[PDB]
């Protein structure tokens, strides 16, 4: 599934949610693999480089969509700033044209993902212990501390429940401002855009709510599980299954944190557009 994001005015990007999770899962496998032994630590330079070459390659496949994406930006530019029928239909076709462009470059995206799976599985396959019945967990401990711990704290320092309460509040206010607002001639083009922006904002809200639930669920699971795989040893097979389980937990957690932030920014970019149209209704036309 695809998520379209408008973080700043004039900027528009998309994410293939399964691809982001897949690419990230293999990043964790690669790192857990090299951190297990002190002799393989120095391979961080080579792993950082390969992952960077894959992200830049994936970005080069989306950068070859930039024409149709900029065409959608211009349609959004007209919609967001009227100061709606054909404009509403214009928006949906340009949106379906972009979605069609992403499906056409599927083979190009899939291969990079497949190239990352091959690299990740290969590093992981090469994971060896001095004594297979007593595998160290220093790698799991180092990886968590250096790639994951700061993200759990970042989430805990923020208040995402308040963020959803503050988002519903803005949605409640626009619903009230639309209803408890005296009707006026020529305001129709603006009333339709507000009702439209509000719907897109309610859709963005539902996504943020869906992702915050995953962040909250995964933050407890990660913190609980990490305690059980940290200051001990495992038989090789158990160590590997334990690394696989953590990578899946990390990948899902990271993905939706990344998406919540991006959708938070898009809810507020579209909120700036509601403030502007309501300002035009009250000041340029005074609709008490």
């Amino acid at each position: 599934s695809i998520d379209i994001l408008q973080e700043k005015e004039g900027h528009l990007d998309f994410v293939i949610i399964p691809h982001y999770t897949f690419l990230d899962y293999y990043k964790h496998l690669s790192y857990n693999s090299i951190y297990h032994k002190s002799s393989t630590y120095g391979k961080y330079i080579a792993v950082d480089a390969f992952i960077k070459k894959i992200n830049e390659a994936y970005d080069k496949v989306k950068s070859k969509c930039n024409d149709i994406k900029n065409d959608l930006i211009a349609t959004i530019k007209k919609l967001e700033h009227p100061y709606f029928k054909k404009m509403m239909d214009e928006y949906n076709t340009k949106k379906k044209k972009l979605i069609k462009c992403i499906k056409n470059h599927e083979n190009d995206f899939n291969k990079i993902c497949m190239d990352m799976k091959n690299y990740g599985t290969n590093l992981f396959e090469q994971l060896s212990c001095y004594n297979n019945n007593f595998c160290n967990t220093n790698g799991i401990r180092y990886h968590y501390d250096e790639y994951i711990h700061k993200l759990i704290l970042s989430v805990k320092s923020k208040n995402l429940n308040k963020d959803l309460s503050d988002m519903t509040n803005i949605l409640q206010q626009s619903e009230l401002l639309l209803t408890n607002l005296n009707k006026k001639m020529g305001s129709y083009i603006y009333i339709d855009t507000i009702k439209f922006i509000h719907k897109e904002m309610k859709h963005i809200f539902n996504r943020i709510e869906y992702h915050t639930k995953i962040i909250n669920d995964k933050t407890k699971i990660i913190q609980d599980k990490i305690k059980l795989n940290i200051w001990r040893t495992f038989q090789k097979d158990e160590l590997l299954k334990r690394i696989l389980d953590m990578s899946n937990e990390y990948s899902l957690f990271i993905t939706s944190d990344h998406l919540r932030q991006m959708l938070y920014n898009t809810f507020y970019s579209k909120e700036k557009h509601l403030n502007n149209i309501f300002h035009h209704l009250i000041y340029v036309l005074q609709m008490k």
Partner: antibody
Framework: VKLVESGGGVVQPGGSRKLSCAAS????????MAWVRQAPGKGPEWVTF????????YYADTVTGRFTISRENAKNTLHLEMSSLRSEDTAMYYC???????????????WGAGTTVTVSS | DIVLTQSPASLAVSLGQRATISCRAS??????????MQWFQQKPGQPPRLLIH???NVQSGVPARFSGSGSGTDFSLNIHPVEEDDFAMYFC?????????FGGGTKLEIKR
């Protein structure tokens, strides 16, 4: 670091053969392994590859469905089960150790002396 | 399938001279800024011996007189200066796409 192939000899057409390869001087389970063959008067031809823990297995289209690579990590042994042998399979069969370079590629660094398989009636 | 075409098929050289042998691939053997071209040496009745792996990476134990260059589809092996033990067969090989392919070979022979 040594690789020793065994199991060669004469096979009649349509016949089968198993080839073994004993590895010494390194941790066998830490490497990908392969069979490469060389027909008399011809260059090397890659036939099959098995990764460290057998997650990845590849075959040449010329061998696909007829040959089976396998490994016994604890016994330092690479195996090659050959099945519907034609005259075209007559070759020196080499066993090779594969290194996974951190730039994301496999290369063969250590090869054994080989074992001859002669497919003739 | 990737077809590696080696040129020349045979090359005669004298002791102390440079020997440059080339390989051309049917399509790019590049994989994320790395050209996956290997070079092997082979003497009669002996298995192939690895010389270069990353198009340019000299294997440990292989002397400094051997060097590799090129990218994409055009690759070359340089031996300078040529020594007595250098007269052998040389093959190139790609590991970018399976089946992993070798070239036909170039025989480096002594001039007399």
């Amino acid at each position: 670091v040594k690789l020793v192939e065994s199991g060669g000899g004469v096979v009649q057409p349509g016949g089968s053969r198993k080839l073994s390869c004993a590895a010494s001087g390194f941790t066998f389970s830490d490497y990908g392994m392969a069979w490469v063959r060389q027909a008399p008067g011809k260059g090397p031809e890659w036939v099959t590859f098995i990764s460290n823990m057998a997650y990845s297995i590849y075959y040449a289209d010329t061998v696909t469905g007829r040959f089976t690579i396998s490994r016994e990590n604890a016994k330092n042994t690479l195996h090659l089960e050959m099945s519907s042998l034609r005259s075209e399979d007559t070759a020196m069969y080499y066993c090779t150790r594969a290194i996974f370079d951190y730039a994301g590629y496999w290369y063969f660094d250590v090869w054994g002396a080989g074992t001859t398989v002669t497919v003739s009636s | 399938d990737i077809v590696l075409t080696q040129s020349p098929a045979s090359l005669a050289v004298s002791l102390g001279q440079r020997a440059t042998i080339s390989c051309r691939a049917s399509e790019s053997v590049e994989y994320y800024g790395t050209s996956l071209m290997q070079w092997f040496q082979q003497k009669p009745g002996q298995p192939p011996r690895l010389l270069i792996h990353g198009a340019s990476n000299v294997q440990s134990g292989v002397p400094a007189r051997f060097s590799g260059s090129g990218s994409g589809t055009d690759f070359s092996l340089n031996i300078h200066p040529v020594e007595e033990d250098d007269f052998a067969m040389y093959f190139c090989q790609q590991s970018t796409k399976v089946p992993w392919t070798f070239g036909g070979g170039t025989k480096l022979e002594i001039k007399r």
